[PDB]
Protein backbone atom coordinates (compact mmCIF):
# COMPACT_ATOMS: atom_id res chain seq x y z
CA UNK A 1 0.00 0.00 0.00
CA UNK A 2 2.37 2.69 1.30
CA UNK A 3 5.60 1.53 -0.36
CA UNK A 4 3.89 1.84 -3.74
CA UNK A 5 3.19 5.52 -3.09
CA UNK A 6 6.67 6.09 -1.65
CA UNK A 7 7.98 4.75 -4.96
CA UNK A 8 5.55 6.86 -7.01
CA UNK A 9 6.43 9.95 -4.97
CA UNK A 10 10.13 9.09 -4.92
CA UNK A 11 10.10 9.36 -1.13
CA UNK A 12 11.28 6.98 1.58
CA UNK A 13 8.85 5.85 4.28
CA UNK A 14 9.56 3.81 7.41
CA UNK A 15 7.64 2.09 10.20
CA UNK A 16 9.20 3.70 13.25
CA UNK A 17 9.49 3.45 17.03
CA UNK A 18 8.07 1.13 19.66
CA UNK A 19 5.80 -0.39 17.02
CA UNK A 20 8.86 -1.98 15.42
CA UNK A 21 9.93 -3.27 18.84
CA UNK A 22 6.51 -4.82 19.44
CA UNK A 23 6.67 -6.42 15.99
CA UNK A 24 10.05 -7.92 16.90
CA UNK A 25 8.37 -9.19 20.07
CA UNK A 26 5.61 -10.52 17.83
CA UNK A 27 3.09 -8.27 19.59
CA UNK A 28 -0.03 -7.50 17.55
CA UNK A 29 -0.40 -3.75 17.05
CA UNK A 30 -3.14 -1.80 15.26
CA UNK A 31 -1.60 1.62 15.94
CA UNK A 32 1.23 2.28 13.49
CA UNK A 33 3.65 5.22 13.42
CA UNK A 34 5.64 6.23 10.35
CA UNK A 35 8.55 8.56 9.68
CA UNK A 36 9.10 9.76 6.14
CA UNK A 37 12.02 11.28 4.27
CA UNK A 38 10.00 13.32 1.83
CA UNK A 39 6.68 15.06 2.28
CA UNK A 40 5.02 12.85 4.88
CA UNK A 41 1.75 14.77 4.78
CA UNK A 42 1.37 14.47 1.00
CA UNK A 43 2.17 10.77 1.19
CA UNK A 44 -0.48 10.23 3.85
CA UNK A 45 -3.10 12.32 2.07
CA UNK A 46 -2.44 10.36 -1.12
CA UNK A 47 -2.78 7.13 0.85
CA UNK A 48 -6.13 8.14 2.34
CA UNK A 49 -7.17 9.38 -1.10
CA UNK A 50 -6.51 6.00 -2.71
CA UNK A 51 -8.15 4.12 0.16
CA UNK A 52 -10.94 6.69 0.08
CA UNK A 53 -10.86 7.32 3.82
CA UNK A 54 -10.67 10.51 5.86
CA UNK A 55 -7.34 12.19 6.61
CA UNK A 56 -6.58 14.76 9.33
CA UNK A 57 -3.59 16.96 8.39
CA UNK A 58 -1.34 18.78 10.88
CA UNK A 59 1.00 21.27 9.10
CA UNK A 60 2.25 22.71 12.40
CA UNK A 61 3.70 19.42 13.64
CA UNK A 62 4.29 18.22 10.09
CA UNK A 63 2.29 15.04 10.61
CA UNK A 64 -0.99 13.49 9.45
CA UNK A 65 -3.40 11.10 11.15
CA UNK A 66 -5.63 8.79 9.12
CA UNK A 67 -7.68 5.76 10.17
CA UNK A 68 -8.60 2.66 8.19
CA UNK A 69 -11.00 0.22 9.83
CA UNK A 70 -9.97 0.01 13.48
CA UNK A 71 -6.36 0.28 12.33
CA UNK A 72 -4.90 3.72 13.05
CA UNK A 73 -2.07 5.27 11.02
CA UNK A 74 0.15 8.24 11.79
CA UNK A 75 2.63 9.71 9.31
CA UNK A 76 5.34 12.01 10.63
CA UNK A 77 7.99 14.03 8.82
CA UNK A 78 11.61 13.24 9.70
CA UNK A 79 12.98 15.90 12.04
CA UNK A 80 15.89 16.63 14.36
CA UNK A 81 13.72 18.01 17.18
CA UNK A 82 15.36 18.34 6.36
CA UNK A 83 16.67 15.41 8.42
CA UNK A 84 17.70 11.83 7.65
CA UNK A 85 15.92 8.86 9.22
CA UNK A 86 18.97 8.25 11.41
CA UNK A 87 18.72 11.76 12.85
CA UNK A 88 15.02 11.28 13.58
CA UNK A 89 15.81 7.95 15.25
CA UNK A 90 18.69 9.13 17.43
CA UNK A 91 16.45 11.76 19.05
CA UNK A 92 14.26 9.11 20.70
CA UNK A 93 14.47 7.60 24.17
CA UNK A 94 15.83 4.04 24.21
CA UNK A 95 17.69 1.56 22.01
CA UNK A 96 14.65 -0.71 21.62
CA UNK A 97 12.72 2.38 20.56
CA UNK A 98 15.52 3.50 18.25
CA UNK A 99 14.88 1.15 15.32
CA UNK A 100 12.79 1.23 12.14
CA UNK A 101 11.66 -0.98 9.25
CA UNK A 102 11.44 -0.05 5.57
CA UNK A 103 8.12 -0.30 3.75
CA UNK A 104 10.01 0.98 0.70
CA UNK A 105 10.00 -1.53 -2.14
CA UNK A 106 13.74 -2.16 -2.67
CA UNK A 107 14.84 -2.63 0.97
CA UNK A 108 11.44 -3.91 2.17
CA UNK A 109 11.87 -6.26 5.12
CA UNK A 110 15.12 -4.67 6.28
CA UNK A 111 15.42 -3.72 9.95
CA UNK A 112 17.66 -0.69 10.47
CA UNK A 113 19.55 -0.68 13.77
CA UNK A 114 22.29 1.92 14.23
CA UNK A 115 22.57 1.93 18.00
CA UNK A 116 22.50 -1.79 18.73
CA UNK A 117 18.87 -1.67 19.77
CA UNK A 118 18.43 -5.22 18.52
CA UNK A 119 21.67 -6.21 20.23
CA UNK A 120 20.39 -4.72 23.49
CA UNK A 121 16.95 -6.18 22.79
CA UNK A 122 17.80 -9.83 23.47
CA UNK A 123 19.81 -9.05 26.61
CA UNK A 124 16.75 -7.51 28.28
CA UNK A 125 18.40 -4.10 28.52
CA UNK A 126 17.03 -0.55 28.68
CA UNK A 127 19.66 1.70 27.13
CA UNK A 128 19.47 5.41 26.35
CA UNK A 129 20.97 6.71 23.10
CA UNK A 130 22.95 9.66 24.49
CA UNK A 131 24.31 10.30 28.02
CA UNK A 132 22.28 13.50 28.51
CA UNK A 133 19.05 11.65 27.62
CA UNK A 134 17.63 12.02 31.14
CA UNK A 135 18.46 15.69 31.64
CA UNK A 136 17.04 16.26 28.17
CA UNK A 137 13.67 14.67 28.94
CA UNK A 138 13.20 13.99 32.70
CA UNK A 139 10.02 11.94 32.07
CA UNK A 140 12.33 9.18 30.78
CA UNK A 141 13.41 8.67 34.41
CA UNK A 142 10.05 7.02 34.94
CA UNK A 143 9.70 5.66 31.41
CA UNK A 144 12.84 3.52 31.48
CA UNK A 145 11.80 1.98 34.78
CA UNK A 146 8.30 1.42 33.39
CA UNK A 147 9.68 -0.51 30.43
CA UNK A 148 12.06 -2.38 32.72
CA UNK A 149 8.99 -3.23 34.77
CA UNK A 150 6.84 -4.60 31.96
CA UNK A 151 9.39 -6.51 29.91
CA UNK A 152 11.49 -7.60 32.90
CA UNK A 153 14.43 -5.61 31.54
CA UNK A 154 17.56 -4.51 33.40
CA UNK A 155 18.99 -1.01 33.01
CA UNK A 156 22.49 -0.76 31.53
CA UNK A 157 25.22 0.47 33.88
CA UNK A 158 25.52 3.93 32.33
CA UNK A 159 21.72 4.19 32.14
CA UNK A 160 21.33 3.44 35.84
CA UNK A 161 24.13 5.86 36.77
CA UNK A 162 22.68 8.73 34.74
CA UNK A 163 19.24 7.86 36.06
CA UNK A 164 20.20 8.12 39.72
CA UNK A 165 22.14 11.28 38.88
CA UNK A 166 19.13 12.93 37.23
CA UNK A 167 16.95 11.87 40.15
CA UNK A 168 19.47 13.22 42.65
CA UNK A 169 19.52 16.46 40.65
CA UNK A 170 15.84 16.77 41.51
CA UNK A 171 14.93 17.27 37.86
CA UNK A 172 11.80 15.26 38.63
CA UNK A 173 10.31 18.14 40.62
CA UNK A 174 11.29 20.79 38.07
CA UNK A 175 9.96 18.74 35.16
CA UNK A 176 6.61 19.73 33.57
CA UNK A 177 3.82 18.31 35.72
CA UNK A 178 1.35 17.25 33.03
CA UNK A 179 3.85 14.95 31.36
CA UNK A 180 4.66 13.21 34.65
CA UNK A 181 0.97 12.83 35.45
CA UNK A 182 0.37 11.28 32.03
CA UNK A 183 3.34 8.92 32.36
CA UNK A 184 2.14 7.76 35.78
CA UNK A 185 -1.37 7.35 34.35
CA UNK A 186 0.32 5.21 31.70
CA UNK A 187 2.16 3.17 34.33
CA UNK A 188 -0.95 2.10 36.24
CA UNK A 189 -2.40 0.60 33.07
CA UNK A 190 0.31 -2.06 33.19
CA UNK A 191 -0.33 -5.44 34.81
CA UNK A 192 3.38 -5.38 35.66
CA UNK A 193 2.62 -2.13 37.50
CA UNK A 194 3.71 -3.58 40.85
CA UNK A 195 7.22 -4.30 39.54
CA UNK A 196 7.29 -0.76 38.16
CA UNK A 197 6.43 0.32 41.70
CA UNK A 198 9.37 -1.79 42.88
CA UNK A 199 11.71 0.13 40.57
CA UNK A 200 9.97 3.33 41.68
CA UNK A 201 10.78 2.59 45.32
CA UNK A 202 14.31 1.56 44.38
CA UNK A 203 15.11 4.80 42.55
CA UNK A 204 12.87 6.85 44.86
CA UNK A 205 10.90 8.65 42.15
CA UNK A 206 7.59 9.05 43.99
CA UNK A 207 9.31 10.86 46.86
CA UNK A 208 10.39 13.56 44.41
CA UNK A 209 6.86 13.70 43.02
CA UNK A 210 4.24 13.47 45.76
CA UNK A 211 4.38 15.80 48.77
CA UNK A 212 5.21 14.25 52.13
CA UNK A 213 5.42 10.73 50.73
CA UNK A 214 7.69 8.05 52.21
CA UNK A 215 7.80 4.25 52.19
CA UNK A 216 7.20 1.70 54.94
CA UNK A 217 7.06 -2.11 55.03
CA UNK A 218 3.35 -2.35 55.86
CA UNK A 219 2.33 -0.55 52.67
CA UNK A 220 4.50 -2.90 50.60
CA UNK A 221 3.04 -6.02 52.21
CA UNK A 222 -0.49 -4.67 51.72
CA UNK A 223 0.42 -4.09 48.07
CA UNK A 224 1.52 -7.70 47.57
CA UNK A 225 -1.62 -8.93 49.34
CA UNK A 226 -3.60 -6.53 47.15
CA UNK A 227 -2.05 -8.22 44.13
CA UNK A 228 -3.20 -11.56 45.52
CA UNK A 229 -6.76 -10.23 45.92
CA UNK A 230 -6.72 -8.71 42.42
CA UNK A 231 -5.53 -11.98 40.88
CA UNK A 232 -8.18 -14.00 42.72
CA UNK A 233 -11.03 -11.65 41.80
CA UNK A 234 -9.93 -11.38 38.17
CA UNK A 235 -9.80 -15.18 38.16
CA UNK A 236 -13.24 -15.85 39.64
CA UNK A 237 -15.36 -13.18 37.94
CA UNK A 238 -14.14 -12.08 34.51
CA UNK A 239 -17.20 -9.94 33.73
CA UNK A 240 -16.97 -7.93 36.96
CA UNK A 241 -13.50 -6.58 36.11
CA UNK A 242 -12.57 -2.96 36.83
CA UNK A 243 -9.44 -0.82 36.75
CA UNK A 244 -7.19 -2.35 39.39
CA UNK A 245 -4.24 -0.02 38.85
CA UNK A 246 -6.03 2.64 40.88
CA UNK A 247 -6.40 0.52 44.03
CA UNK A 248 -2.62 0.23 44.45
CA UNK A 249 -2.41 4.01 44.18
CA UNK A 250 -5.05 4.23 46.90
CA UNK A 251 -2.78 1.99 48.98
CA UNK A 252 0.15 4.34 48.40
CA UNK A 253 -1.70 7.54 49.31
CA UNK A 254 -3.71 6.03 52.19
CA UNK A 255 -1.26 7.38 54.77
CA UNK A 256 -1.23 10.86 53.22
CA UNK A 257 -3.56 13.70 54.22
CA UNK A 258 -7.07 13.98 52.78
CA UNK A 259 -6.64 17.50 51.36
CA UNK A 260 -3.45 17.07 49.32
CA UNK A 261 -4.50 13.53 48.45
CA UNK A 262 -7.77 14.85 47.06
CA UNK A 263 -5.86 17.53 45.15
CA UNK A 264 -3.55 14.78 43.89
CA UNK A 265 -6.33 12.48 42.68
CA UNK A 266 -7.94 15.48 41.00
CA UNK A 267 -4.51 16.18 39.52
CA UNK A 268 -4.53 12.63 38.16
CA UNK A 269 -8.03 13.12 36.71
CA UNK A 270 -9.10 9.84 38.33
CA UNK A 271 -12.56 8.26 37.78
CA UNK A 272 -15.45 9.10 40.12
CA UNK A 273 -15.63 5.75 41.92
CA UNK A 274 -11.91 6.01 42.68
CA UNK A 275 -12.24 9.33 44.51
CA UNK A 276 -15.42 8.07 46.18
CA UNK A 277 -13.60 4.96 47.41
CA UNK A 278 -10.80 7.25 48.62
CA UNK A 279 -13.18 9.51 50.56
CA UNK A 280 -14.89 6.45 52.00
CA UNK A 281 -11.49 4.95 52.84
CA UNK A 282 -10.35 7.99 54.82
CA UNK A 283 -13.44 8.70 56.95
CA UNK A 284 -15.94 5.87 57.31
CA UNK A 285 -13.80 2.79 56.61
CA UNK A 286 -12.69 2.29 60.22
CA UNK A 287 -16.21 2.11 61.62
CA UNK A 288 -17.10 -0.08 58.64
CA UNK A 289 -14.46 -2.67 59.53
CA UNK A 290 -15.46 -2.27 63.18
CA UNK A 291 -19.12 -3.18 62.64
CA UNK A 292 -18.05 -5.75 60.03
CA UNK A 293 -16.04 -7.74 62.56
CA UNK A 294 -18.95 -7.34 64.98
CA UNK A 295 -21.37 -8.93 62.52
CA UNK A 296 -22.73 -12.23 63.83
CA UNK A 297 -25.06 -12.85 60.89
CA UNK A 298 -24.43 -13.00 57.14
CA UNK A 299 -27.50 -10.92 56.23
CA UNK A 300 -26.19 -7.94 58.18
CA UNK A 301 -22.99 -8.24 56.17
CA UNK A 302 -25.18 -8.33 53.06
CA UNK A 303 -26.92 -5.11 54.11
CA UNK A 304 -23.57 -3.48 54.90
CA UNK A 305 -21.76 -4.48 51.70
CA UNK A 306 -24.67 -3.98 49.28
CA UNK A 307 -24.48 -0.18 48.92
CA UNK A 308 -20.68 -0.41 48.80
CA UNK A 309 -18.71 -0.30 45.56
CA UNK A 310 -17.01 -3.47 44.32
CA UNK A 311 -13.59 -1.85 44.73
CA UNK A 312 -14.41 -1.13 48.37
CA UNK A 313 -15.12 -4.82 48.97
CA UNK A 314 -11.97 -5.91 47.13
CA UNK A 315 -10.12 -3.49 49.40
CA UNK A 316 -11.86 -5.03 52.42
CA UNK A 317 -10.59 -8.45 51.35
CA UNK A 318 -7.11 -7.50 52.61
CA UNK A 319 -7.91 -8.31 56.24
CA UNK A 320 -7.10 -11.96 56.97
CA UNK A 321 -10.15 -12.36 59.22
CA UNK A 322 -12.57 -10.71 56.78
CA UNK A 323 -11.63 -12.80 53.72
CA UNK A 324 -14.16 -15.63 53.99
CA UNK A 325 -16.92 -13.13 54.74
CA UNK A 326 -16.27 -11.15 51.56
CA UNK A 327 -15.96 -14.37 49.55
CA UNK A 328 -19.26 -15.53 51.05
CA UNK A 329 -20.96 -12.29 50.01
CA UNK A 330 -19.54 -12.47 46.49
CA UNK A 331 -20.24 -16.10 45.62
CA UNK A 332 -23.33 -16.74 47.77
CA UNK A 333 -25.22 -14.02 49.66
CA UNK A 334 -25.93 -11.55 46.83
CA UNK A 335 -27.20 -14.34 44.56
CA UNK A 336 -30.33 -14.93 46.64
CA UNK A 337 -33.57 -14.81 44.64
CA UNK A 338 -37.21 -15.76 45.28
CA UNK A 339 -40.38 -17.43 43.87
CA UNK A 340 -43.67 -15.89 42.70
CA UNK A 341 -46.50 -17.22 44.91
CA UNK A 342 -44.78 -15.96 48.06
CA UNK A 343 -44.61 -12.41 46.69
CA UNK A 344 -48.29 -12.62 45.75
CA UNK A 345 -49.31 -13.78 49.23
CA UNK A 346 -47.25 -10.93 50.68
CA UNK A 347 -49.14 -8.53 48.42
CA UNK A 348 -52.35 -10.32 49.42
CA UNK A 349 -44.17 -2.69 53.11
CA UNK A 350 -43.35 -4.99 50.19
CA UNK A 351 -39.59 -4.43 50.15
CA UNK A 352 -39.66 -4.50 53.94
CA UNK A 353 -41.04 -8.03 54.01
CA UNK A 354 -38.70 -8.89 51.13
CA UNK A 355 -35.73 -7.96 53.31
CA UNK A 356 -37.45 -9.83 56.15
CA UNK A 357 -37.53 -13.05 54.12
CA UNK A 358 -33.97 -12.39 52.98
CA UNK A 359 -33.12 -12.13 56.67
CA UNK A 360 -34.92 -15.46 57.18
CA UNK A 361 -33.18 -17.49 54.47
CA UNK A 362 -29.72 -15.91 54.23
CA UNK A 363 -28.70 -17.02 57.74
CA UNK A 364 -28.42 -20.67 56.69
UniProtKB/Swiss-Prot annotation:
Membrane-spanning intervals of the chain: none
Binding site for ATP: 18-21, 92-93, 97, 137-146, 150, 179
Amino-acid positions noted as binding Mg(2+) in the UniProt annotation, renumbered to this chain: 31, 33
Family, similarity comment: Belongs to the tRNA nucleotidyltransferase/poly(A) polymerase family.
Function: tRNA nucleotidyltransferase involved in the synthesis of the tRNA CCA terminus. Adds the terminal adenosine residue to tRNA. Can incorporate CMP into tRNA ending with C74C75 (tRNACC), with very weak efficiency.
Entry's free-text remark on domains: Adopts a seahorse-like shape and consists of four domains: head, neck, body, and tail.
Protein name, entry field: A-adding tRNA nucleotidyltransferase
Protein species of origin: Aquifex aeolicus (strain VF5)
Upper lineage: Bacteria, Pseudomonadati, Aquificota, Aquificia, Aquificales
Amino acid sequence: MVGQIAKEMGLRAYIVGGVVRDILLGKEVWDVDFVVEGNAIELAKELARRHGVNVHPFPEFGTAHLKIGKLKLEFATARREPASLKEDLIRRDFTINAMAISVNLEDYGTLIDYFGGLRDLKDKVIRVLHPVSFIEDPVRILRALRFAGRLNFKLSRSTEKLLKQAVNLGLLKEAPRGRLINEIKLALREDRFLEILELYRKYRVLEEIIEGFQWNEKVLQKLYALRKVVDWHALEFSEERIDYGWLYLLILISNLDYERGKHFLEEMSAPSWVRETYKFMKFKLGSLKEELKKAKENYEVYRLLKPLHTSVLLLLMLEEELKEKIKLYLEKLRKVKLPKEKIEELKKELGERIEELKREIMNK
